Amino acid sequence: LKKLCKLLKKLCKL
Amino acid sequence: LKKLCKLLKKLCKL
Amino acid sequence: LKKLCKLLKKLCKL
Amino acid sequence: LKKLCKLLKKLCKL
Amino acid sequence: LKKLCKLLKKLCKL
Amino acid sequence: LKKLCKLLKKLCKL
Structure with missing residues (x-):
């Protein structure tokens, strides 16, 4: 969940 | 779902 | 986009 | 896709 | 967030 | 990002 966010x-x- | 996509x-x- | 983000x-x- | 969902x-x- | 989720x-x- | 997208x-x- 930290990586996805x-x-x-x-x-x-961007 | 059409709008979201x-x-x-x-x-x-990007 | 602004709203979605x-x-x-x-x-x-959360 | 299974992990993402x-x-x-x-x-x-929440 | 309810609608988005x-x-x-x-x-x-799917 | 390429993978997520x-x-x-x-x-x-769908």
Whole structure:
């Protein structure tokens, strides 16, 4: 869940 | 689901 | 997109 | 896909 | 978040 | 992100 959320965070920041 | 998937597709254009 | 990412942010903070 | 959906389900327990 | 999670649930059941 | 987006695309094939 920590890894998925950081990827979602990167997806939204891009 | 059509709208959501459209938005996810746009996110995945990065 | 802005709304979706705000929701994903909240989901991930929960 | 099975792991991702399991993670999404967990996220959605809020 | 309720609506989004209902959509993600539907996406994951397929 | 490439892997996550591939999974989201497949999920969106429904």
